[PDB]
Amino acid sequence: NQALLRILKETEFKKIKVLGSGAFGTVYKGLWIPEGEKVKIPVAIKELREATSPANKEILDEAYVMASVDNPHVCRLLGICLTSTVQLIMQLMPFGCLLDYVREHKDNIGSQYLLNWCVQIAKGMNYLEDRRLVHRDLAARNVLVKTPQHVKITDFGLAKKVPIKWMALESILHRIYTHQSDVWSYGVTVWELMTFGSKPYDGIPASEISSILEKGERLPQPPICTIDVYMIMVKCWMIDADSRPKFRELIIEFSKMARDPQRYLVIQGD
Ligand SMILES: *[C@@H](CC(=O)Nc1cc2c(Nc3ccc(OCc4ccccn4)c(Cl)c3)c(C#N)cnc2cc1OCC)CN(C)C
């Protein structure tokens, strides 16, 4: 179709530096210069190394699926460069990533800027769930910042070495991913959010995990974060999928907290 996805050619941009990496591919702050038109436009870029190639085209059929998303908390794909390597370009969000960013400013951060981010990310999925689209990878590192008040969800639907420290039991056990597997990736993404970006399990061996969970363990309570909140992070880490809390229920609960965080997220700052 002729969606809102713009197909560009290698003669419209040229990376300039490396921002992030790891996962499927990397990313750089290239410079888009629409052909025939003029306007040094800035944009990122992901040169996905490989995947599996199970035609060299589907890579597109999905793009449009990435270009359809109609959510203010779910980054939408701009264009794409098809060739010896697929190039994913999009609007450059000058702000870091929910991950690093935060980390950067754990000082005067805010009980609100977070008690939302959790509502912004949760509100982001509730849409993906309504579209039969599974992320497969949800982490502070996979969430951009279009403003310390407007966060969006990047990277998702791509898969269509692994984030064991995020995935669930099944996904780790029986490579099974569902609208329930993320609810697990979420409650965590926030934890790293509450503990101002902190590699969960710092130490343990990705392997020893499948077990550590088999008996509900580790993943302490983010000092700050109060109680009722944690129950949200934990209740999301249930071994019985049908036990977790669908985001639709996560958005209504977080919105009930944000309207008075000073009492839900203790902090010795302000
Ligand atoms: C955080 C480092 C960090 O801040 N990295 C970034 C990333 C971006 C991105 N990210 C991004 C995401 C996806 C892209 O494409 C594929 C795609 C798009 C949408 C949905 C699914 N898949 C591309 Cl090309 C880039 C964007 C975008 N879009 C814009 N600006 C970014 C800035 C940036 O850092 C800026 C300093 C922790 N590291 C591990 C990465």
Regarding whether 198 and 97 lie in a shared domain, the answer is yes
**The one-letter amino acid at 146:** K
Residue 142 · residue 155 · CB < 8 Å: yes
Protein residue closest via CA to atom 17 of ligand 1 = 155
Q: What is the CA(263)–ligand 1 centre distance, in A?
A: 34
Regarding whether 110 and 220 lie in a shared domain, the answer is yes
Range of the structural domain that residue 37 is part of: 1-92
Q: What technique was this entry resolved by?
A: X-ray
What resolution in angstrom units was achieved for this structure? 3.5
Burial class (CB within 10 angstroms; exposed 0-12, middle 13-18, buried 19+) of 201: middle
136: Cβ below 6 Å to ligand 1?
no
Q: What is the CA(259)–ligand 1 centre distance, in A?
A: 30
Regarding whether 246 and 115 lie in a shared domain, the answer is yes
Q: What is the CA(84)–ligand 1 centre distance, in A?
A: 21
Protein residue closest via CA to atom 37 of ligand 1 = 141
Regarding whether 74 and 107 lie in a shared domain, the answer is no
88: Cβ below 6 Å to ligand 1?
yes
Please tell me the total count of domains within the chain. Answer: 2
Protein residue closest via CA to atom 24 of ligand 1 = 45
Regarding whether 101 and 60 lie in a shared domain, the answer is no
156: Cβ below 6 Å to ligand 1?
yes
Regarding whether 51 and 23 lie in a shared domain, the answer is yes
Q: Kindly report the number of other CB atoms within 10 A of residue 118's CB atom.
A: 26
Residue 42 · residue 32 · CB < 8 Å: yes
Atom of ligand 1 nearest to the CA of 96: 4
Among this protein's residues, is 70 annotated catalytic? no
CB-based contacts of 207, cutoff 8 Å, min separation 6: none
Mutate to test the pocket of ligand 1, among 64, 81, 144, 199 (most ligand atoms within 8 A of CB): 144
Three-state SS for the chain is: CCCCCEECCCCCCCCCCECCCCCCCCCECCEECCCCCCCCEEECCEECCCCCCCCCCCHHHHHHHHCCCCCCCCCCCCEEECCCCCEECCECCCCCEHHHHHHHCCCCCCCHHHHHHHHHHHHHHHHHHCCCCCCCCCCHHHEEECCCCCEEECCCCCCCCCCCCCCCHHHHHCCCCCHHHHHHHHHHHHHHHHCCCCCCCCCCCHHHHHHHHHCCCCCCCCCCECHHHHHHHHHCCCCCHHHCCCHHHHHHHHHHHHCCHHHCECCCCC
Regarding whether 122 and 73 lie in a shared domain, the answer is no
CATH number at residue 87: 3.30.200.20
Which of 77, 92, 107 is where one domain is finished?
92
Q: What is the CA(31)–ligand 1 centre distance, in A?
A: 14
Regarding whether 105 and 236 lie in a shared domain, the answer is yes
Q: Kindly report the number of other CB atoms within 10 A of residue 55's CB atom.
A: 8
Which of 92, 125, 145 is where one domain is finished?
92
CB-based contacts of 116, cutoff 8 Å, min separation 6: 149, 254, 258
Q: What is the CA(223)–ligand 1 centre distance, in A?
A: 29
What values do phi and psi take at 18, rounded to 5? -105, 125
